[PDB]
Design a protein around this ligand. Structure first.
Ligand SMILES: Nc1nc2c(ncn2[C@@H]2O[C@H](COP(=O)(O)OP(=O)(O)OP(=O)(O)O)[C@@H](O)[C@H]2O)c(=O)[nH]1
Ligand SMILES: Nc1nc2c(ncn2[C@@H]2O[C@H](COP(=O)(O)OP(=O)(O)OP(=O)(O)O)[C@@H](O)[C@H]2O)c(=O)[nH]1
Ligand SMILES: Nc1nc2c(ncn2[C@@H]2O[C@H](COP(=O)(O)OP(=O)(O)O)[C@@H](O)[C@H]2O)c(=O)[nH]1
Ligand SMILES: Nc1nc2c(ncn2[C@@H]2O[C@H](COP(=O)(O)OP(=O)(O)O)[C@@H](O)[C@H]2O)c(=O)[nH]1
Ligand SMILES: [Mg+2]
Ligand SMILES: [Mg+2]
Lengths: 434, 51, 426, 111, 427, 430
């Protein structure tokens, strides 16, 4: 009955979805040909549908404008898993233009995307939500996601549509129109998303440099950690828990205001396989690494801000007595701080089933793990760093001739500026105490 | 009274044996998987050299 | 003859009741299939207090299970005694509340409250004489409270002169689990004060202190805790299905212990628990049985009897004992503690004895006591509730679901005067 | 798996033995013409990767009660007159205030 | 009937708890399991005086053991007689005092007095008529001197009229084993003189003197030291647990032993000691018992009776012995040593007898005696303390914890008026 | 539940870190792989699989000496994240190791000790080891003390110091390194022992019958001192001592926290055959200035207080028999306001002899800690030479070039000047 739909936007979305679906297949014991080994249970039903021949088909749509990223999926090992109408391919890419991906290029395949969305909703008997995986950097993942969220909000009333996103790093960037793309998605992630997770590239880079003992990691090693985080999110759906949560459950328990739905996600432990021979791994020892400011997976320091809400999801041999003991320990110290109008700011869930190791991965076989999702006041600095850069670029009216050309008006940048400034002032007015 | 005493003693002994079995199982499994990791590192180095 | 209907609400209630039926079916000698395997006929005489007759020499419990999750009860039926339930009684919703008191009271509650009510009305009128209903629930969740309170108000109106016994799991500050936990518990006592006959205040943090110091378990899982809660549930209604020299059922205790209609929250405690290392060193007689009952550490709530004034005390004994040793040991505690006990109600003692002890035990007792320290819990919930509501936090998930902004204020005021009339009666 | 890792005996055979898995990518010699996506799903799972103990959700077991319909009362209306006295011989209703099983009295005739 | 709850304070209190509960179990026939294996019914008639009844035909000692450091707690419970005591009675803190009186009385002892008195009051009210309490503690340690005053001062106000026994392990000039030991001794005797009915004085230099010239052991370990002090402490509470011709209780001794409430420091001694090679050369006869005892070599503390005066001495005897032979040997010591006793109290000896002897012996004797050479110990404690304070030694360990320096000078003035009051009763 | 953290600073600290932990592993029976074939829980921490990690943090500013630990025999026993290396060293400079270079890893170690102090359910106190001669052993160790003071208020921080020798020196600015750390260890050290290298040099010459010893044979001897100090925590005894015990029973004033450390007997296996050792015949060797481990003679001074640690089959009768004979000698002196200056401790288990070591298997031992006034004798030799060097204004061009003010030299000499005066006023009898 419980069923969520994955929508992977862009090349980053396709790589993230490939990692996540390989992880899900190896977790649920399903061959890449599509079917389970029939020589000997609804854990697969959370994401897979049953055909007439006994084959499993994932409930995902891989949409990207570039032709070149989808043919690798059609040629590789998992060519048999996906029905070929799920893989939606455009004709030209947006060329990192929000205007092109909103007004000209993305309006050709939107009918096909909504037809496949209608087909999967017809297959679903009652859906827990959609999960849309994207990044703020590219033109597809900005603009096509921007009107896709609007189409899903019009066609679907109150169904939960999580927006998992990759934020542009404050120092390392592979684009010049990157702030132009990123700021014009702020209206999209404000009211067309029921919840909006983001991760930062530079922080995951730092953690993969230090903790995992990898001299030269890459996008596969980042997508492994992203898939582990999303797997620890969805294990509450898929497997029985001593104390269980749901998507609606933690979105209600974490989102304090209709404008404030931007959590920060970290994972613990992220350790090396040789050091797992060295370290003790208990729940009280891994709950510290979630709130260490070094291991936070966003390049923003939570010590500058005040914590509002915390969400904790534990996997493995985890006991509520030790969980509450660790919470009682971490509440006392002054370095961890809480707002005055939220004394009991925690939400806790436990699942028996541990995370599952991957072939070719970098982590170790871990018995007790935790994923943490906090709603903080530390994102003001991380968005102010992009604010100053975007205004600095838009100072001399640079990179505007195209966006004027395809059809967005000139004042929409000022509209985005006023929305962003109002949202930062909402952060300030929340951050003031009494 | 002797029924109560003997039942308490047998439950305590059963718990102790279960914990000892868990610890020994953990030792053996960790040793095996570390040996497998060493073999896999040797394999990847061989492939890199061949390329 | 005197019949009790069992209700279970939410995921908390299902785990409370699942261990409870495992306790008493084994007490009555009932196999997991359901047939009777007993050694004495005194077990067989009173089974119809909770059980309903079936064919083939089988008995089925008179219970329903209420939870707003579609797949939550598959864990219940997969248990060792899970198949004993009639499949015609399982009632559940389609979309979860999300620990929202509004969802279980306004949005998702209305479609399901009718389907539950005709089930409990069908199996109530078939009985001989309905002594009361019994409900287990938690005050920290949307389904356990919101669907629980929506049932309770309709039970009182449909059955005006009956007994309605509830079990309330009050949220605790140090074992707090939910961000919107004070919002649920403040509006739940509002419906728990005005249409409820009886209510016990079991608390999660006090369950942990019993395992921490007295019982000394290394791994206090939720299964072991529900064994302790069901033992309090087993001891209070042991006179209803077993003969005793001095009998005391639920109707007698509710009359004597409730002097005013808004005072129906009590604090339980249990006595025989010991560690297995210290079991052989402990003396199991009557005077050392009430020694551990009075202990402030052995209380099942988050309040201190040394701070508070006892209103009325009761001890339901389970085992074979003489009457004067029960009388003289209980009287000495009232005389020696001349300060805590109230002065205008002399001889606060309620006594209850049944001859049949539990299996694996020869002496036991259970505690119920009305205390003036109950204002400690309610005021502590009050100050956390008014912290959230002052800056208007977490309201759009409740205001947009059907209520106004003024239901919290009248619920706070009906909680503000509740602790005040506890203060003047103290 | 049972050769090295002892199991809880509720796992399926697909987790007891990885040899049933065959759709995974086999290993060739590496070459110059390689795609960085071929890291994903590159290799079949060995014995040290499948979990020992597996806990499903069996949702059809509740779906079979969910799909039929929820239990309802449609004119199953009967009311039985019941008494407070224990004896099967006597049925004293609150409305009918009269004693049953009449007394066989020697002296006074017919009450 | 009459019940006394045992109290133990400090690390020194633990191994004397282990040694005393061993010997009292041997004389009453208790196995390490806990049950009864005896051959005479007289051992079973009076058992609740120190044991606590329990289900299963077993008796748990009615003792409380207080320590601030958990290191020796495992050593007590893992001994040959370590599984008899109930685990709830073992109570310990998490941070030790560390040979400091100030830690155990103001800052760290305060958080544990609530928990230990919760244990004490629960088992105190179980008895019908509790006869009193019995404490053994060391002044050379921080917990025995710091907590030991805090428990005793609190129990005096909680139970205003009750018998209390204390055993005080005082420092020695030769066998000094702590630099700050005079600071511990001074700040507690003021508490020990206002809040104590009865005491004894035990010093470790005295025990080494006994084992050298009388017992002839080359290596007197603390196990043999605890053997002697337990036999003294078992030897006074005999009439509680066995009847006799003339039975005397701790209240009956005390009313005939204390003339004024500040005069409670009493001196013990033990008669039976000898050697195995001289065992055949010794005759157990009641003149020999009063001969070997009255030698000043066998005193149990740091004193000498030739420099002082006997106010009153108490007699407790063991063995089926005639009353006239008890009577005549006690009148002759009053006749002969005419200068040592006081003049204004005639008949300065009180006597008690018991029927049965302890195991392995047929006759024995023990005295409790009030001497004025106890102020010689008080002058020796005072003189090292008063000299140490002019140079302001270790005051940062004391003043910075909350107290003032005026608490020391009132402790000095109280003990200086104690020894002055001691001197006036001498002449 | 007793447990203590080892901290070691510098090339001296890492070499004594390995030698101390080589003694610890054989004492508790631990193979180099980290697994056995509750005594160890004081200095180790058990893994779910059963591995025991030494619970220390090694700090250094050269990678040349840590790497031998990462390559040697015990390369799998030590945790990879515990041995922390800098990138460039101060090279015998206090100011470089204090204000400029040491702050790069002041944030790394204060996060690494938190991972081990969060494991401290109850912690007796830290042990820190350093050497005054080096740059990191003077500079970074100075800023190590303020952060451990601010983070933890009253936690114990013992230290073994390596104070420069009066005649043989490994450097020229070594007195500059030593004097500028006097103010830091004045107010931020709870207890502070001192041991000098040349005082150990003569001991191995005349006692151990070794023609050419090296720093290995010196590192084994100092590890024998720290073993007998911590033996009471791990191993039960007739009188157990604590870290809080001898801190109070030896230190009279807050400004005076500088004992002297000795060990006896320290004899060869050739001299273990002939000489009978008793309790009295080994406690007298801690009184002789020839066996003293600091180049100063307590005969010129007076004994302030005495702490004794006994190891093995030591009878308490023989403890009190020797003390009486000790006190009768007038060659030793006590002050008039410490009439009972003795504090003793007893442990049953004899110490462990190491293969490749030099001392023999012995049943009895003493580790005596006596505070004296004769430290002012050895302090005056260094304080003469610091002003003698500073008279012609040499080497300070580097220290000013690091940024730190010239006046910190003038305040450090005067802080040491009145410290000697305070040590002189105590020695005056009443
Ligand atoms: N974290 C993370 N970010 C990625 C990954 N791949 C791409 N990105 C981000 O994607 C941004 C650029 O977008 P693209 O990778 O080109 O994909 P796109 O969003 O569809 O843009 P177009 O290909 O031009 O349509 C860069 O700024 C990267 O930060 C990835 O594997 N992990
Ligand atoms: N007692 C003792 N001292 C040593 C030993 N080895 C080195 N030292 C001391 O170490 C000092 C020299 O500094 P090191 O410790 O070697 O090096 P460092 O601490 O890293 O400081 P830098 O050399 O500036 O990086 C000398 O003054 C010696 O006193 C040893 O084995 N035993
Ligand atoms: N005593 C007890 N309390 C429990 C147990 N499981 C959960 N709880 C409490 O119930 C609260 C959550 O209630 P929830 O399960 O969401 O109620 P529901 O929405 O009706 O299913 C938590 O705050 C827990 O403290 C249990 O097994 N025993
Ligand atoms: N008579 C006697 N004295 C002892 C015994 N054990 C220790 N002592 C003395 O007590 C002192 C140590 O006491 P300590 O352990 O510090 O007491 P605590 O701090 O209260 O636990 C030593 O100086 C010993 O001389 C014993 O068994 N008998
Ligand atoms: Mg692309
Ligand atoms: Mg260095």
């Amino acid at each position: 009955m419980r069923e969520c739909i994955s929508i992977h936007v862009g090349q980053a979305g396709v790589q993230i979805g490939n990692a996540c679906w390989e992880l899900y297949c190896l977790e649920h014991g399903i061959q890449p040909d599509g079917q389970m080994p029939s020589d000997k249970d609804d854990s697969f039903n959370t994401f897979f549908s049953e055909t007439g021949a006994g084959k499993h088909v994932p409930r995902a749509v891989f949409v990207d404008l570039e032709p070149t990223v989808i043919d690798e999926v059609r040629t590789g090992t998992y060519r048999q898993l996906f029905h070929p109408e799920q893989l939606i391919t455009g004709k030209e890419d947006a060329a990192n233009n929000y205007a092109r991906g909103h007004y000209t290029i993305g309006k050709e395949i939107i009918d096909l995307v909504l037809d496949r969305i209608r087909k999967l909703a017809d297959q679903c008997t009652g859906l827990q939500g959609f999960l849309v995986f994207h990044s703020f950097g590219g033109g597809t993942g900005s603009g096509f996601t921007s009107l896709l969220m609007e189409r899903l909000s019009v066609d679907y009333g109150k169904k939960s549509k999580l927006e998992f996103s990759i934020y542009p790093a404050p120092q390392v960037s592979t684009a010049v129109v990157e702030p132009y793309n990123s700021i014009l998605t702020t209206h999209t992630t404000l009211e067309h998303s029921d919840c909006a997770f983001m991760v930062d590239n530079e922080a995951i880079y730092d953690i993969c440099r230090r903790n995992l003992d990898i001299e030269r990691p890459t996008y596969t090693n980042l997508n492994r950690l992203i898939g582990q985080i999303v797997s620890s999110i969805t294990a509450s759906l898929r497997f029985d828990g001593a104390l269980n949560v749901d998507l609606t459950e933690f979105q209600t328990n974490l989102v304090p205001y209709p404008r404030i739905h931007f959590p920060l996600a970290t994972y613990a432990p992220v350790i090396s396989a040789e050091k797992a021979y060295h370290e003790q791994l208990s729940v009280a020892e891994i709950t510290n690494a979630c709130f260490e400011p070094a291991n936070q997976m966003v390049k923003c320091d939570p010590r500058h801000g005040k914590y509002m809400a915390c969400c904790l999801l534990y996997r493995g041999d985890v006991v509520p007595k030790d969980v509450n003991a660790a919470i009682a320990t971490i509440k006392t110290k002054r370095t961890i701080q809480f707002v005055d109008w939220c004394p009991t700011g925690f939400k806790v869930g436990i699942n028996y089933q541990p995370p599952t190791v991957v072939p070719g991965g970098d982590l170790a076989k871990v018995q007790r793990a935790v994923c943490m999702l906090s709603n903080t006041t530390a994102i003001a600095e991380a968005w102010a760093r992009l604010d100053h850069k975007f205004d600095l670029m838009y100072a001399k009216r640079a990179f505007v001739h195209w966006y004027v050309g395809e059809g967005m008006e000139e004042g929409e940048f000022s509209e985005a500026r006023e929305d962003m400034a109002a949202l930062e002032k909402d952060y300030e007015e929340v951050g003031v105490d009494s | 009274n002797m029924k109560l005493v003997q039942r308490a003693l047998q439950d305590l002994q059963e718990e102790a044996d279960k914990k000892k079995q868990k610890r020994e199982d953990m030792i053996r499994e960790q040793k095996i998987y570390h040996k497998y990791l060493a073999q896999r590192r040797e394999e990847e180095k061989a492939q890199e050299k061949e390329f | 003859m005197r019949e009790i209907v069992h209700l279970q609400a939410g995921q908390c209630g299902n785990q409370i009741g699942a261990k409870f039926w495992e306790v008493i079916s084994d007490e009555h000698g009932i196999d997991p299939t359901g047939t009777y395997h007993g050694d004495s006929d005194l077990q067989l005489e009173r089974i119809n207090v909770y059980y309903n007759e079936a064919t083939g020499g089988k008995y089925v419990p008179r219970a329903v299970l209420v939870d707003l999750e579609p797949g939550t009860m598959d864990s219940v039926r997969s248990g060792p005694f899970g198949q004993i339930f009639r499949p015609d009684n399982f009632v559940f919703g389609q979309s979860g509340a999300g620990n929202n008191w509004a969802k279980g009271h306004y949005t998702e509650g209305a479609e399901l409250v009718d389907s539950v009510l005709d089930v409990v009305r069908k199996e109530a009128e078939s009985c001989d004489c309905l002594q009361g209903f019994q409900l287990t629930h938690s005050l920290g969740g949307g389904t356990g409270s919101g669907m629980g309170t929506l049932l309770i108000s309709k039970i009182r109106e449909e059955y005006p002169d009956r007994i309605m016994n509830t079990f309330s799991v009050v949220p605790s500050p140090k074992v707090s689990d939910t961000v919107v936990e004070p919002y649920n518990a403040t509006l739940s006592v509002h419906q728990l004060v005005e249409n409820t006959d009886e209510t016990y205040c079991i608390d999660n943090e006090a369950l942990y202190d019993i395992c921490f110091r007295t019982l000394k378990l290394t791994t206090p899982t939720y299964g072991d805790l529900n064994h302790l809660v069901s033992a309090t549930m087993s001891g209070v209604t042991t006179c209803l299905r077993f003969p005793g020299q001095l009998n005391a059922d639920l109707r007698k205790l509710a009359v004597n212990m409730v002097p005013f209609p808004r005072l129906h929250f009590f604090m339980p405690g249990f006595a025989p628990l010991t560690s297995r290392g210290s079991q052989q060193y402990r003396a199991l007689t009557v005077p050392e049985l009430t020694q551990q009952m009075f202990d402030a550490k052995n209380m099942m709530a988050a309040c201190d009897p040394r701070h508070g004034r006892y209103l009325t005390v009761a001890a339901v004994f389970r085992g074979r004992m003489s009457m004067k040793e029960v009388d003289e040991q209980m009287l000495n505690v009232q005389n020696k503690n001349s300060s805590y006990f109230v002065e205008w109600i002399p001889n606060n003692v309620k006594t209850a004895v049944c001859d049949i002890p539990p299996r694996g035990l020869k002496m036991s007792a259970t505690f119920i006591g009305n205390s003036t320290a109950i204002q400690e819990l309610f005021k502590r919930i009050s100050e956390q509730f008014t912290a959230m509501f002052r800056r208007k936090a977490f309201l759009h998930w409740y205001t947009g679901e059907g209520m106004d902004e003024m239901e919290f204020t009248e619920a706070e005021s009906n909680m503000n005067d509740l602790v005040s009339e506890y203060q003047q009666y103290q | 798996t049972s050769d090295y890792y002892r199991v809880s005996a509720d796992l399926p055979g697909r987790f007891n033995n990885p040899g049933w898995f065959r759709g995974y990518r086999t290993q060739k010699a590496v070459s110059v013409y390689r795609t960085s996506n071929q890291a994903y799903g590159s290799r079949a799972p060995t014995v040290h990767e499948m979990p020992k103990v597996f806990y499903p959700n069996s949702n059809k077991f509740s779906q079979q009660l969910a799909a039929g319909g929820m239990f309802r009362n449609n004119t199953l209306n009967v009311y039985l007159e019941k008494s407070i006295v224990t004896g099967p011989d006597n049925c004293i209703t609150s409305c009918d205030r009269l004693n049953f099983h009449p007394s066989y009295n020697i002296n006074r005739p017919s009450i």
